[PDB]
Amino acid sequence: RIVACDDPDFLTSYFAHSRLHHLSAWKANLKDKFLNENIHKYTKITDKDTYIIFHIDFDCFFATVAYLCRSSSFSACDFKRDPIVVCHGTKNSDIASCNYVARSYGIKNGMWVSQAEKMLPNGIKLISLPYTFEQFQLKSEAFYSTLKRLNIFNLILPISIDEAVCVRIIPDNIHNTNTLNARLCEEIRQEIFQGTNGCTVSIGCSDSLVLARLALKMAKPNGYNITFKSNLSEEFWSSFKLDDLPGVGHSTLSRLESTFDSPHSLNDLRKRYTLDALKASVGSKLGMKIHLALQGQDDEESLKILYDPKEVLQRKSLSIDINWGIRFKNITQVDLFIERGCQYLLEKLNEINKTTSQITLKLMRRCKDAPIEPPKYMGMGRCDSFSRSSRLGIPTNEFGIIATEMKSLYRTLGCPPMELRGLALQFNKLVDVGPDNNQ
DNA sequence: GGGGTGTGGTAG
DNA sequence: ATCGCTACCACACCCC
Ligand SMILES: Cc1cn([C@H]2C[C@H](O)[C@@H](COP(=O)(O)OP(=O)(O)OP(=O)(O)O)O2)c(=O)[nH]c1=O
Ligand SMILES: [Ca+2]
Ligand SMILES: [Ca+2]
Ligand SMILES: [Ca+2]
């Protein structure tokens, strides 16, 4: 039942098991579905519209669904009392999702099982459930079907398998109130709970995208929060960590902590920062984004999804990344893998009826001082990254052209096959295919 | 002013 | 064991 990377079935088996592959494939499908359902519609927010954002997201999605769908081997498992994770393995295996019991011990999505087990007091046992990928998708379908059926939103924007941004336009003749917004939140939560046979969503409700995201975090688990710009307070900002802000990850977090004397909440940050010191710390565009976010306001870039969702959701690149299980003995096997990847990508490219004029090969190579077999079974371990791109000239979907150039790109980066630990193949620029192809 | 490249980072 | 994907914005540093 084990498929090595030189086996023709490797890509199929890896993608079938990989949560992150599913995460990307689901999002791509939701994007395509939105564009197809709106090819002739012109559903979009205009400058004349005043809107409310309902940002809706499943609580511990994989853990909830895997629990509801668990096999009889786990019948006695208790979602409200047991710490529950979803993962493949037993040690250096990622926790895809953990329930809020597990989180009360400090366990987080993305931790290794080995790390999470150590956070449990003696006598407390971690419950590890398998993935149920098809049921994740079915629950998502129920989610999106329910959102449409409620007929309360002018625009429903897919964010992910378990998350959507739902926009309600308020006519100027209508007096919106907290009570009406609360009743809509409760309707949404109950209808999704029924429609999904027991999954919970939380909801952030506001007059900006960024505040609706923060409200969502405040609402979790299994709740809703309504915080409009009018309602902003010190109590609100004091409730969030710095990387609760959209666009702030670990690297930006570290830079903000170094620049502003280790702020411990968004309130700390907003009382200490200056716009200029903030652009200097994290960059001009991200600095302006954060500055606006601390006023509860969206930046120009984030607003594009409301005003032109078709262009924001339109796919502009196509790629695969395989950075697990990569163990090749020679260049012949590397070349065959590149060919299989190009075949896979060209199927995707032909499905969307496009050609490509620029491609990229990226690789991960074992660091010179890193063990040949890393801590994580079949992991890439510590690696150096290399990337090179090539303009094709004539846009094409021809395997011969693209695969030959990808294999040449690999040659130019000089990685010995045995040192290779990861490969990415990218079609960076896509070109339409029209009815007129006479030259 | 226009173009290019590889790399960093974040989102889900 | 264990499945560490993928799209896209932003940036620094080059060309004219
Ligand atoms: C962010 C992320 C999510 N996922 C999957 C598992 C998650 O259950 C699902 C949705 O992601 P999230 O919404 O980020 O997480 P969650 O729903 O488990 O927990 P929360 O209550 O805090 O929202 O997507 C991954 O597999 N890898 C990831 O990096
Ligand atoms: Ca979620
Ligand atoms: Ca989500
Ligand atoms: Ca963030």
Numbering used by the authors: 306 to 744
Sentences from the paper on this structure:
Rev1 is a translesion DNA synthesis (TLS) polymerase involved in the bypass of adducted-guanine bases and abasic sites during DNA replication. During damage bypass, Rev1 utilizes a protein-template mechanism of DNA synthesis, where the templating DNA base is evicted from the Rev1 active site and replaced by an arginine side chain that preferentially binds incoming dCTP. Notably, Rev1 is the only DNA polymerase known to use an amino-acid side chain to encode for an incoming nucleotide, instead of a templating DNA base. Additionally, Rev1 does not undergo large conformational changes upon incoming nucleotide binding.
To obtain structural insight for the interaction of Rev1 and an incoming dTTP, we determined a ternary complex (Rev1/DNA/dNTP) structure of Rev1 with an incoming dTTP. The Rev1/DNA binary complex crystals were then transferred to a cryoprotectant containing dTTP and CaCl2 to generate Rev1-dTTP ternary complex crystals. Importantly, Ca2+ permits incoming nucleotide binding but does not facilitate catalysis in crystallo. The resulting Rev1/DNA/dTTP ternary complex crystal diffracted to 1.70 Å and was in space group P212121. The overall structure of the Rev1-dTTP ternary complex is similar to the Rev1-dCTP ternary complex structure (RMSD = 0.228 Å), including the evicted templating guanine base, the R324 protein template, and Rev1 active site side chains. The incoming dTTP is coordinated by the R324 through a single non-planar hydrogen bond between the O2 of the Watson-Crick edge and the Nε of R324. The non-planar R324-dTTP interaction leads to a 2.6 Å movement in the dTTP base towards the primer terminal dG. To accommodate the dTTP, the primer terminal dG moves 1.4 Å downward from the conformation seen in the Rev1-dCTP ternary complex structure. This brings the 3′-OH of the primer terminal dG 4.4 Å away from Pα of the incoming dTTP, which is ~1 Å increase compared to the Rev1-dCTP ternary complex structure.
